């Protein structure tokens, strides 16, 4: 689980640009800023290679 990957973000990356900020992306209109099943979900996920 040490390897993590981001699939959720507001905008695309410019070429040769690194993003390290971990801010929860809000699918809903209201920025609730709180971890939940759907609202204000964590942006980057972790793999489970086995």
């Amino acid at each position: 689980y040490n390897y993590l990957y981001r699939l959720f973000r507001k905008s695309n990356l410019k070429p040769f640009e690194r993003d390290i900020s971990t801010e929860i992306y809000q699918a809903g209109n209201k920025p609730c800023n709180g971890v939940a099943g759907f609202n204000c979900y964590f942006p980057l996920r972790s793999y489970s290679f086995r």
Partner: protein, 50 residues
């Protein structure tokens, strides 16, 4: 769950904001596609299970 009904939806427009903005205690563990890029582009042959 043993006799999970399959519902096919076609010949209309499927707005996902209604699901996002109602019944707040739901989980959205979608795989392979982001809700924002679900909204901007689209697909065909809507299949819904329950």
């Amino acid at each position: 769950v043993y006799a999970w009904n399959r519902k096919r939806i076609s010949n209309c427009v499927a707005d996902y904001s209604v699901l996002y903005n109602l019944a707040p205690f739901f989980t959205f563990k979608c795989y392979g596609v982001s809700p924002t890029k679900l909204n901007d582009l689209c697909f065909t042959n809507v299949y819904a299970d329950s």
